[PDB]
Amino acid sequence: ANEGDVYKCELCGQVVKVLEEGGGTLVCCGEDMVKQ
Amino acid sequence: ANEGDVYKCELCGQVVKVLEEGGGTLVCCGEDMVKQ
Ligand SMILES: [Cd+2]
Ligand SMILES: [Cd+2]
Known part of the structure; x- marks a missing residue:
């Protein structure tokens, strides 16, 4: 996504x-993690 | 996972x-990220 970022699962x-960073998402609990 | 861990997408x-840490996985690119 973007280095120096934070992703929290809802x-x-x-x-x-x-x-x-790469080029994908962090699908956790079948839900795309949110950014903080 | 336990805090103090790293996850790299393959x-x-x-x-x-x-x-x-949390009771979930980081499915990225349709693939559960691996631990580093
Ligand atoms: Cd990925
Ligand atoms: Cd989760």
Whole structure:
């Protein structure tokens, strides 16, 4: 997505800080993680 | 996953450092990201 970003799941509540962007999404709990 | 972990996609190559573990997975590119 964009280095130095954070993605939090709106289901479990998993938060991960992207340190290396790629070209996809973090579908967690069958739901595309949200950005913080 | 447990905090203090990293997840790299085997498609795009997106690396994200889990800040707050959770009961879910980071399905990216239709593939559950792998741990680093
Ligand atoms: Cd990906
Ligand atoms: Cd989740």
